[PDB]
Amino acid sequence: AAIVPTRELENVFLGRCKDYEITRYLDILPRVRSDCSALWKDFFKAFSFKNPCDLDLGSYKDFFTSAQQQLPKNKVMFWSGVYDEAHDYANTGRKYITLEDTLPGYMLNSLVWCGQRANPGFNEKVCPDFKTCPVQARESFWGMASSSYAHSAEGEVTYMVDGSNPKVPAYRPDSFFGKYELPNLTNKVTRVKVIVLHRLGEKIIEKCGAGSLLDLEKLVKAKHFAFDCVENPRAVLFLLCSDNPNARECRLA
């Protein structure tokens, strides 16, 4: 494990960008004003010719400004600890939007990149363990992405959490949700709908109305939002049951 940057970053970013422009999410999400080139100048300038750890929460502000899309009322989803589950359920924009569906999220998803001072101004060979930079440098991209996404959310929002992780509560201030989403939700949000995942054949850790979720309910209420919570709603249980068919909580009548 040495962190390997994405080869041909500009070309890959440009590809993804053009592809999304013309063919992805057309009626689910609006297009952005900026061409794929300017977005690049914007994304490049933020990290290039600077040291890997030489970045703040303001670095990519210009990019995120060009790249923000109006988000559909009531359809915005945040997730913690449940990447595969939340994304199957959200269903590629069809049921809910996730960051990964937005242009910015789509473009940069799974990509690895960093600066250097020497020409060319980005490092194509190696990249530092993120644990070695200042948090605001290491969070500077996806933190600002979350912030900007949460800011744009209107209506009901939905949040999917993991209620079975004995080592990690369903809700925590130190997650990205906790740090960058929940506190950035505007007064154009009305209700927070929490979906709690209860892993098949695993012990239930976080019940709804107790521990960290109650903690969360208090915060939601404090922000003058409406709040509700569900544990394993049907629609979701079945997604679950598909990968673990012979599972107990999937006994068909």
Place this chain on the structure above:
Amino acid sequence: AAIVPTRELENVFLGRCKDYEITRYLDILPRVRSDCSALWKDFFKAFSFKNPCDLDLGSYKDFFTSAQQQLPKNKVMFWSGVYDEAHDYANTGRKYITLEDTLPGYMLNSLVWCGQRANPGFNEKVCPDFKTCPVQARESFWGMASSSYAHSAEGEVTYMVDGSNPKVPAYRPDSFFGKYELPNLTNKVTRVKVIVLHRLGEKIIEKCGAGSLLDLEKLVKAKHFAFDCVENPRAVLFLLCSDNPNARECRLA
């Protein structure tokens, strides 16, 4: 009576190629030897500067010879009628490979294009509907696509079909599957396993052992493959029930 084609077709095609090339199906599918630019050559030369209907089964043969990646033993799936449920089940290469997960597939999926013979060799305004073009010109691309895909399979293959369509038999000789995939399976293939879909709260139309599935079962046995069949296997079913959780077919116990 006529359809609009995909804007900036080459940008889309290349962009896609580079995103596939660098970032998609890495642990799952291998890369091709050709530069993106070369894939764009064999491909454009097929339909370019011709009547929109001047296409046949061989037109794109070089493109499909180029874009052709070996396929992993046993993970290869065909479908007819059941698109979303098939790609849902397959799970973006995790459980099965679809034609759409492959380089040629990925690239052109959903795209609309057509030659004209005047500059620039393609029409950017308008293009023919389905029935408007002859059978071999309508099926030149996706049929040749299906051809190689099939030619390349090994071990167990998998066929998912619609068993609830009064208008269209689960199996057909004149489907893309029956015209192009089936005839081109090789002695390296050993078994064809069918999945019959039975849409929820809809009336069963076809069953294993019968109708076109029996026709099919014989055709298999005659090319010397083992055969197998199942109707709404639990794993499949649960996906279906996630969209219609209220349906009788999946009352929990």
